Structure 1
Amino acid sequence: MISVTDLRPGTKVKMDGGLWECVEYQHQKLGRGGAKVVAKFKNLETGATVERTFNSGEKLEDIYVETRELQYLYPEGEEMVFMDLETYEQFAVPRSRVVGAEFFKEGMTALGDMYEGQPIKVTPPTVVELKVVDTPPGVRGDTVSGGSKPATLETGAVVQVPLFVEPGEVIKVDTRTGEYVGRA
């Protein structure tokens, strides 16, 4: 347990059954009034955020979460199998816990957030490089006047790419938005 006044951006805690990370902290006391702590948290598993107000003397359940490098090996049903590059432990991770799962090339390395020895989230670099395996050659866009065309990547994912991108070309993809950001 930790005192709410010890919270700081980055502190990880367990609240209402959820795992969170403090992102904003404010400790305040006005006159003879009791001191308060107002803090914002972002979930470590979902996209939820929450802001809470505590009395300065309250406590929270601090948790330990370690980030380790995991290498994607292969898919298995609705799960993705990774190898921990430090401990060599194999983990079968549900695709829903993997950010930008469709942009994972076998052999790619990502960062896994570990809680109680198991990954609760796996995040690849913001930008990854993937090869275009199928896209209309030349200026064959899907619209008459658009400046882009659909392209199937080596992972099976499909994204819009400029007309000048050709089959076999390696592109850069933002794993957060799932969009083309440039040529490799």
Structure 2
Amino acid sequence: MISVNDFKTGLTISVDNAIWKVIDFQHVKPGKGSAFVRSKLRNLRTGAIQEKTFRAGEKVEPAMIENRRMQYLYADGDNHVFMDNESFEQTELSSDYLKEELNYLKEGMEVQIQTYEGETIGVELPKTVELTVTETEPGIKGDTATGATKSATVETGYTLNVPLFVNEGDVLIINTGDGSYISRG
């Protein structure tokens, strides 16, 4: 287990029935006779920013985060099949996760599924995904406004705002994670 003198700018600890990621720890000695550690740590499951004060003399359980890059297979949209490329472990993701993965994904593409003890805690899509734009209307009206965008549809079925000079068939690069539009190839 982890002692209160062992923390880093990134360290995963399982406490409060959650898995946390210490962003910045403060080993504080208030002069009470016991030292504490005010740790700024992010709930790795929800993405929430919290802080926890650890107490000297009470060790905590460490959390090892398991990253699995899986090839994107397909099934009915309640569960999608992902092939563990680490070694042949078929893992199916549930509708809730599929909702986000259905926003950005490519079939046959490797995504990084983040598990803890086999339990899916998150799914990481590649930071730059390439999606073909299907059904969009060009016609940039002479102006060169950078915010001249229209509601376009990509192959995934996701609707995103493309510049008015984007034509059907163009492969749009998107920064998955933030949703920032990158320019068509």
Cα distance in 2 between the residues matched to 1:41 and 1:181:
31
Q: Name the structure 2 match of 1:121.
A: 122
- In terms of mean alpha carbon deviation, does 58-67 or 157-166 score higher? 58-67
Q: Name the structure 1 match of 2:92.
A: 92
- In terms of mean alpha carbon deviation, does 64-73 or 90-99 score higher? 90-99
- In terms of mean alpha carbon deviation, does 65-74 or 95-104 score higher? 95-104
Deviation per CA, 1:124-178: give whole Å up to 9, x if none: 12221111011013338xxxxx611111101110100001111000111122233
1:159–1:179 Cα contact (<8 Å) kept:
no
Aligned residues: percent identity?
43
Q: Name the structure 2 match of 1:143.
A: none
AA matched with 1:155: T
Q: Name the structure 1 match of 2:62.
A: 62
Cα distance in 1 between the residues matched to 2:61 and 2:99:
26
Change (3 A) 1:99 1:131: same
Q: Which runs of 5+ in 2 are unaligned?
A: 142-146
TM-score normalized with structure 2 length:
0.85
Cα distance in 1 between the residues matched to 2:99 and 2:53:
30
Cα distance in 2 between the residues matched to 1:107 and 1:96:
20
SS of 1:96 mapped into structure 2:
helix
CA RMSD of aligned residues (A): 2.2
1:148–1:161 Cα contact (<8 Å) kept:
yes
1:70–1:109 Cα contact (<8 Å) kept:
yes
Q: Name the structure 2 match of 1:73.
A: 73
- 2:174 counterpart of 1:178: no
Cα distance in 2 between the residues matched to 1:138 and 1:47:
40
TM-score normalized with structure 1 length:
0.85
Q: Which runs of 5+ in 1 are unaligned?
A: 141-145
Cα distance in 1 between the residues matched to 2:98 and 2:41:
20
